[PDB]
Amino acid sequence: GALFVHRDTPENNPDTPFDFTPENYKRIEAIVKNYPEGHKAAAVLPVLDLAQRQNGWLPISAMNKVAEILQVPPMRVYEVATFYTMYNRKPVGKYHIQVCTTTPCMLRNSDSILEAIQKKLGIKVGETTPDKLFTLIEVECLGACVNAPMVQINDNYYEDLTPKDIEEIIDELKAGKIPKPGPRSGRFSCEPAGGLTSLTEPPKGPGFGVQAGL
Amino acid sequence: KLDITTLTGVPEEHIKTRKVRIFVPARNNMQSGVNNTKKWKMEFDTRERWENPLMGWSSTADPLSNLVLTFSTKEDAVAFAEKNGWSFDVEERKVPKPKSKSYGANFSWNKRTRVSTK
Amino acid sequence: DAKVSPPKRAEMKTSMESLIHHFKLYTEGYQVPPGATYTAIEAPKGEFGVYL
Amino acid sequence: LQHHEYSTYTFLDLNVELSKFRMPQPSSGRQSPRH
Amino acid sequence: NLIEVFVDGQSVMVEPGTTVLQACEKVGMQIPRFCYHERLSVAGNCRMCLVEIEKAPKVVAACAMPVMKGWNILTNSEKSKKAREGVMEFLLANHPLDCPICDQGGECDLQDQSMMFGSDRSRFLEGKRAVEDKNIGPLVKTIMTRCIQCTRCIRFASEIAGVDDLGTTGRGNDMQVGTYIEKMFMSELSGNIIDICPVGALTSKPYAFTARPWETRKTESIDVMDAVGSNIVVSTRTGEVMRILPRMHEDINEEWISDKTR
Amino acid sequence: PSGEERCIACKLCEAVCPAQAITIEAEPRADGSRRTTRYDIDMTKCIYCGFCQEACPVDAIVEGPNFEFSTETHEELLYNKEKLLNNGDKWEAEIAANIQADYLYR
Amino acid sequence: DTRPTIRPRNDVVHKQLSAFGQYVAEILPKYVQQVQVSCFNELEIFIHPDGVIPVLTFLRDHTNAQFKSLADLTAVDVPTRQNRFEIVYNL
Amino acid sequence: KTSFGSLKDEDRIFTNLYGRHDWRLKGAQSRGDWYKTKEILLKGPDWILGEVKTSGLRGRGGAGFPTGLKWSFMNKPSDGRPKYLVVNADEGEPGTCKDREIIRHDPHKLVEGCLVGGRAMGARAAYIYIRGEFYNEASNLQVAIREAYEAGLIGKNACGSGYDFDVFVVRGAGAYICGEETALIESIEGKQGKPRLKPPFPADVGVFGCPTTVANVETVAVSPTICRRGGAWFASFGRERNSGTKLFNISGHVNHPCTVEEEMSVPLKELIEKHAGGVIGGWDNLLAVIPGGSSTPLIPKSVCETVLMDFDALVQAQTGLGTAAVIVMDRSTDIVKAIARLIEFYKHESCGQCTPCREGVDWMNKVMARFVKGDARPAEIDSLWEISKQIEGHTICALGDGAAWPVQGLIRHFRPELEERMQQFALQH
Ligand SMILES: Cc1cc2nc3c(=O)[nH]c(=O)nc-3n(C[C@H](O)[C@H](O)[C@H](O)COP(=O)(O)O)c2cc1C
Ligand code: SF4
Ligand code: SF4
Ligand code: SF4
Ligand code: SF4
Ligand code: SF4
Ligand code: FES
Ligand code: FES
């Protein structure tokens, strides 16, 4: 339910004021240095990521500016922006909550977490809070596929979520508090819930099992 | 040279004035099929097509306006034109040159061929 | 066979394939495989044959 | 457990630091194959 | 240097690098195709050129796959037939029923290829998609609902025209072809994108709704607007010039004519 | 039913006509739809086969029930687009009823 | 193939017609130039034009070829051949 | 060896898999990583490739292609283009969450693997394309790379061996299709993440139009351990042609959802019960299991009862090891709904390039939704099977095939449920 066409608007017009900060341009220089000469076009994705990280969302002026920076056709930047989901071609809230809804999370009742988020915020999936502090969307295995229902807010992973736990996280963000990223069931990482079924012994140490030939 | 002109029955005006064009039909640029462009064809010169006053329908007096004859080879068309005594202009068949195509060239390392978008 | 017999009008207005064949069959017509035949039937006045 | 510390530009800042450690890149011979 | 490949059991000598489709053309077989264009870079996206090679488990893309010595290209094998039928079914699944109102009607590669290689009925019981049209100028009437995402227009604009304006936006079934912003595709050779488009997504705005291909009489001629000498085909109906189409001449105009000429 | 001419100028009825009696010329209407500027059928050349109505994809050209339309001058037989539209407007009730009574068979 | 769409083909008549075509060719090698049986079981004998009367007389009087009825005699005009007109006798 | 699945902690390659130790260089070296890497590099690219072949390491990304042969493809005289190596870190396959653990908890192991592999294939530098959502994992990886650069492990004269090698990290932008190797190459190059059409094979033409090899995170990370401990060590675990130790991301309706490193050719039921505490509600409560992520077809409980979690055995079971993301589904699971959700995932993650994928996947999603509601007829199931077969084998990438396979598995194993649901829907109306 998104448009892949752009209509000039007061918020999103070619004259919309966007420009990287000088430190951001230095970061862009480093990024371009990473890619070989004659293939500076490879930086379109990371430079667009920097633009999104700075502005919050990507206006058309941002895409044009990235095209200018990398001396690439603007249409290619438009294609990159549309193709990849992470890019926010439209303004989004401060906290962009992303609740996974794929089969693994569904089996773990991620719909309960999604419903809890909807009830607490009062907005439906895809909507943004009137304060413009929260937004809701759906995702796939963000690496927590074995970590129960999980939502990704901004760049933070919250795994093994419960409805009440998700309400707690939302309330912490609403009160300007950063919750601890990671599993909220008490488990650390992806360790078996009922104690370490493997790696119980300490690490063997260097030089262990080294082949005689080496 | 076989002279069937007296036996054809064609009026003398449409035996001398006619300018037969022997050619292979070109491929319609809209489509990509080439099945039509495989046999030689013979057509006559286009003439006046005025408008019928009553309805506006196009009227013609050319009796050979719609005559198109297909021929297996150019020599067949030439011989048929000679038999009927029609001045014939032959257009040599234009076959597209074989073109080297490489999908890899789309991702060249130091060549212009590298495509910007897929 | 919608490449020989035109599809039903309801199908023509619903199926994309039917509309294409309905368009082609009535504009171009079905292509008959190259060949010749003399099919004759016992018509009321006698043998009626067609050398197609 | 230091993931909490990582901020927005952490990845970009680390890449900027890595720039000195990196070595000269190859060249296609053109500024861009568009050229 | 020529390697000996076989098409339907018929031996044919081809230069190394020859694509399967080109060898089939050499023996006289025109494999059905929508995305492949002789003068455009190989794409391989339409998937209509799929053909079976003897002793090969998976059908190959004749438009892209280069031949290998000893390959026996089974152009008319059951695998190839079924592949073509399935791909045509997929192409027509979402294609709008616009044939009566489509200017490409009567000269549509989709129509003829469906009639010759595709099936005769549809199993699509769902609802078709609809794409908003995009204005690209005052010459090319655009109905993107009929687009089959062959990417011919994009490649042409990128290479022959040299104007990098057209492109694909989005991904999946929602992938729309056209400029992301409202921009007019300006080129001296823009008109040719009408011809390259296998379907009636791109249609000549002046020639739109005027006449059908079967009735128009074709007269090969030469252009006089410029000194290039581009060979043109003057399509005339009822003693009236209806449209001007390029005539193939590798040495002068290849397959393209200027917008003024058209 | 809205009142717009069903004919969308596909011209396939012109092609199918075995006597080449239908002459169709179309241009984009002011609105922008495919509306014919000329729909001429000379009944003096038509064979009343019915291929035209079987070909039309919008049920625009339909042979009506009137068999008693003899004229005194040859020119009258040649029917203009206006004549066809007027005939449709006159006989629409019966034509629609007959189509409703036969469309299932077709 | 099978199913109602495909037309059923009878191979027995095909074999019979091929055998009889070979029979005619052997009896008349002087004129018979080519013998073909169509897939729809229609035997066709191509004869040099000088053999119009002999071949027909054989096909009419011979005990094992009693084609005593000229169904249709027609001509096909193919302008791409030197002998454009092709005279076809249906018996 | 005939009974497998008894992997010991002394034989587990990933020792900090659970993040209970120091992921940084100090911890990695204390656990045996970055040990005598100079000798490994100086041993010879041919030696490294031979060790990989002796280990019998196969593609841990899901393809299962022999890793030794695939890497040997690039061990050729340089053609003048700078050879590169790409490490696939997208991990977009639903249920697959191992590579994340490797990157976030043992990044230095992966970096050493990158160095060793690059030496084995004469690569100028390595680009690790990590998923954009894995921002914190990317930060950890970058910290590790910085530590390696400062310590001299990587960079010019890497590990004091003279080899000049670099490790780059490119963050993704949320596209499952980028997991595909050629699509990954295109994404790195800055174009839309649409897969290429082989040939040209990536080994010949890859990133920046240069000889490139794409390898999975686990596949690369196990290479230094394979070299140090010997190929025989890796081969000892698992059956022939299915050797090694594979990370198993047990997920779904299991009592202890977790990721555990277990020996290859391990009995499925054992693996589920040994680590995940068994199926929720008991074994008998299990409905079906998806062994490899989502692309691999489901196996019913009957087959799940006695089956080894290895490539060949699962291939016999009309499925595959894939990423070994065991998705356990209990009998309280609407299998139709789960498979439909997977199809929807594929629909929303399709590149749209190839016609069969672009249109067929969406068509299948529509039909699957109708099946979930029961609003269909029994023949439509056979129609759906035919559609899946048409998509499979006729697409540029394997996303179409990996979306046809779930539908085929659902039909082949639970057609009665589909037919019964359609009957129920008919009775309601
Ligand atoms: C749709 C699709 C998604 C894929 N996703 C991944 C992935 O997330 N991680 C991965 O390692 N390989 C993925 N692959 C496989 C890659 O194309 C490639 O074969 C693999 O990264 C190389 O693994 P290997 O070298 O260990 O054999 C995917 C393939 C396809 C077709
Ligand atoms: S493009 Fe071809 S198939 Fe599509 S509506 Fe137009 S004529 Fe019909
Ligand atoms: S608009 Fe036409 S040429 Fe362009 S991608 Fe679509 S079908 Fe191809
Ligand atoms: S009357 Fe029907 S068939 Fe004739 S042009 Fe109009 S729409 Fe087409
Ligand atoms: S019914 Fe009349 S107009 Fe229609 S096809 Fe027959 S002769 Fe032509
Ligand atoms: S089976 Fe696809 S339309 Fe595809 S290269 Fe694809 S994500 Fe594709
Ligand atoms: S399916 Fe939701 S985290 Fe894996
Ligand atoms: S013509 Fe072969 S895939 Fe397009």
Distance CA H146, CA H163 (A): 18
For residue E177, the cross-strand partners are: E168
Distance CA H99, CA H140 (A): 13
Question: Of E7, F69, E233, which is closest to residue B25 (Cα–Cα)?
Answer: E233
Distance CA B80, CA B2 (A): 10
Exp. method: cryo-EM
Q: How many residues are present in chain E?
A: 262
Strands, E assignment, H199-282: 212-216, 238-239, 242-243, 245-252, 258-263, 266-267
For residue E176, the cross-strand partners are: E169
H237-274 b/e (C-beta count within 10 Å ≥ 16 → b): bbbeebbbbbbbbbbbbbbbbbbbbbbbbbbbbbbbeb
For residue G42, the cross-strand partners are: none
CB–CB of G89/C38 below 8 Å?
Answer: no
Question: How far from H14 is each of A144, H17, H37, H150, CA to CA, in Å?
Answer: 18, 5, 17, 24
Residue type (1 letter), A30: A
Preferred mutation among F11, F54, F99, F102 to probe C, highest tally of C CBs within 10 A? F54
CB–CB of H313/H325 below 8 Å?
Answer: no
Q: Could you tell me if E138 lies within 8 Å of chain F, comparing CB atoms? A: no
CB–CB of H103/H89 below 8 Å?
Answer: yes
Residue B95 CB contacts under 8 Å (≥ 6 apart), including other chains? none
N-to-C CA span, chain E:
43
Distance CA A42, CA A60 (A): 20
Question: Of E48, E42, E47, which is closest to residue E64 (Cα–Cα)?
Answer: E42
- CB of F49 closer than 6 angstroms to any ligand 5 atom: yes
Distance CA H245, CA H222 (A): 9
H15-45 b/e (C-beta count within 10 Å ≥ 16 → b): bbbbbebebebebbbbbbbbbbbbebbbbeb
Question: Of H415, H413, H368, H414, which is closest to residue H387 (Cα–Cα)?
Answer: H368
Taking CB atoms and a 6 Å cutoff, what residues make up the pocket around ligand 7?
Answer: A 100, 102, 104-105, 140-142, 144-145, 150; H 94
Distance CA C39, CA C22 (A): 28
CB–CB of A135/A96 below 8 Å?
Answer: yes
Q: Could you tell me if B56 lies within 8 Å of chain E, comparing CB atoms? A: no
D15 interaction partners in chain H (CB closer than 8 Å) = 142, 169
Distance CA H41, CA H155 (A): 13
Question: Of B45, E178, A85, G74, which is closest to residue H192 (Cα–Cα)?
Answer: A85
Question: Which tokens in the block code for residue A192?
Answer: 């078996």
Residue C45 CB contacts under 8 Å (≥ 6 apart), including other chains? none
CA dihedral H14, H19, H20, H24 (to 10 degrees): 90
E strand or H helix at E185: none
Distance CA E141, CA H159 (A): 63
Residue type (1 letter), H424: Q
CB–CB of H206/H212 below 8 Å?
Answer: yes
Secondary structure of H376-424 as H, E, C letters:
CCCHHHHHHHHHHHHHCCCCCCCHHHHHHHHHHHHHHHHHHHHHHHHHH
- E150 Cα nearest atom in ligand 3: 8
Q: Could you tell me if C49 lies within 8 Å of chain G, comparing CB atoms? A: yes
CB contact under 8 A, C8 and F103: no
Long-range contacts of B31-35 (CB under 8 A, 24+ apart): B31/E107, B31/E108, B31/E109, B31/E112, B32/E33, B32/E37, B32/E109, B32/E198, B33/E30, B33/E109, B33/E112, B34/E30, B35/E30
Distance CA H376, CA H415 (A): 13
Distance CA H429, CA H374 (A): 11
Conformational region of residue B115, where left means phi above 0, alpha means psi within -120 to 50, and beta covers everything else: beta
- The residue whose CA has the least distance to atom 3 of ligand 4 is F56
Residue E109 CB contacts under 8 Å (≥ 6 apart), including other chains? B31, B32, B33, E34, E198, E199
For residue A182, the cross-strand partners are: A158
Distance CA E220, CA E235 (A): 9
Question: Which tokens in the block code for residue G53?
Answer: 């009367």
Place of tokens 């169509």: G38
DSSP state of G51: G
Distance CA H63, CA H66 (A): 9
| E168 CA distance to ligand 3 middle (Å) | 10
Distance CA D10, CA H314 (A): 42
For residue E73, the cross-strand partners are: E7, E53
Cis peptide before H202 (omega within 30 of 0): no
> How many CB atoms are located within 10 Å of the residue G55 CB?
20
Place of tokens 């696939």: H88
Question: Of A158, A55, A176, A180, which is closest to residue A113 (Cα–Cα)?
Answer: A158
Cis peptide before A183 (omega within 30 of 0): no
For residue F40, the cross-strand partners are: F23
CB–CB of H243/H237 below 8 Å?
Answer: yes
- The residue whose CA has the least distance to atom 4 of ligand 5 is F52
Residue type (1 letter), C18: S
| H128 CA distance to ligand 1 middle (Å) | 13
> How many CB atoms are located within 10 Å of the residue A115 CB?
15
E145, E146, E194, E214: residue to mutate for ligand 2 pocket, most atoms within 8 A of CB: E146
Q: How many residues are present in chain G?
A: 91
Distance CA G34, CA G43 (A): 11
Distance CA B118, CA H396 (A): 13
> How many CB atoms are located within 10 Å of the residue C5 CB?
12
CA distance A36 to chain B (A): 11
E strand or H helix at H123: none
CA dihedral G77, G80, G84, G88 (to 10 degrees): -60
What string of DSSP letters covers chain A? ---SS----SSSSTTS-----HHHHHHHHHHHHHSPBT-GGGGHHHHHHHHHHHHSS--HHHHHHHHHHHT--HHHHHHHHHHSSSS-SS---SEEEEEE-SHHHHHTTHHHHHHHHHHHH---TT-B-TTS-EEEEEES-SS-TTSSS-EEETTEEEES--HHHHHHHHHHHHTT--PPPEESSS--TT--TTS-SS--SPP--TTTT--S--
Q: What are phi and psi of B28, to 5 degrees?
A: -60, 120
Question: Which tokens in the block code for residue H81?
Answer: 């283009």
CB–CB of H275/H266 below 8 Å?
Answer: no
Q: Could you tell me if E209 lies within 8 Å of chain F, comparing CB atoms? A: yes
| H346 CA distance to ligand 6 middle (Å) | 10
C-alpha gyration radius of chain H: 22
What string of DSSP letters covers H295-328? TSPPEEHHHHHS-EESHHHHHHTTS--TT---EE
- CB of E80 closer than 6 angstroms to any ligand 2 atom: no
What is the Cβ-side half-sphere exposure of residue A22, based on CA atoms within 13 angstroms?
A: 0
What string of DSSP letters covers B62-116? -TTTT-EEEESSHHHHHHHHHHHT-EEEE----PPPP----SGGGG-SSSTT--S
Handedness of CA H200, H201, H205, H206 (dihedral sign): positive
- CB of F17 closer than 6 angstroms to any ligand 4 atom: no
CB–CB of E238/B58 below 8 Å?
Answer: yes
Strands, E assignment, C1-52: 38-43, 46-51
CA B110 vs. chain centroid, Å, equals: 44
Question: How far from E50 is each of A115, E33, E250, H354, H395, CA to CA, in Å?
Answer: 47, 9, 28, 12, 10
E36, E197, E203: residue to mutate for ligand 3 pocket, most atoms within 8 A of CB: E197
Q: Could you tell me if B110 lies within 8 Å of chain D, comparing CB atoms? A: yes
